[PDB]
Design a protein around this ligand. Sequence first.
Ligand code: CA
Length: 223
Amino acid sequence: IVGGYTCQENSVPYQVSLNSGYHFCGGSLINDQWVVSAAHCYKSRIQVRLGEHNINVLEGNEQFVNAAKIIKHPNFDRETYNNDIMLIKLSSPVKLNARVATVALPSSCAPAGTQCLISGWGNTLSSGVNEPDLLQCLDAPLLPQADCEASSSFIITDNMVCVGFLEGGKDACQGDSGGPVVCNGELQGIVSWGYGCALPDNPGVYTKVCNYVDWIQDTIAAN
Ligand SMILES: [Ca+2]
């Protein structure tokens, strides 16, 4: 997260870190045994880390659980990142508490202008790379598609939504991928891609979770 602020410790209880020997993506806890992330974050094996604040220091609220099933959306397109969503079923249910909690799925597609919270342990620089120890937060609004593409060097599909600032300076970045965009207590987006990070005229692009509520529920029920 570039241009954000350090989240208060465990203040984003649904935020998880996907780890394969190091942090590589984020995710969101949606029930005691399922995590939703981005399909581009797929790996053959993944350890899910919950209750984290400092990912490099054991602070006492961590729960590390291995992924049992890692299910990418069947229509995920690696070239365009269309349908960039994935479900992870944990090998065992986690213990839900104040610091490890679930986030609700969207009841509808939120409108442009809705204020949200984006979070993650991704790169904090708009140039170069800096991986933060502590979870970063960013208050950002959903943007109108037309506004987003006006002077950007990209376009988005109906399964994507731009979130952020047209002026740049504040945005998600590499390492935040798969993480949450929560608005009014509902997961409306998943960090997916962008052109650079925090660059003017190039807001971040996120998977529009409201288009996948049925797939998510069906998948969970089928497994
Ligand atoms: Ca820790």
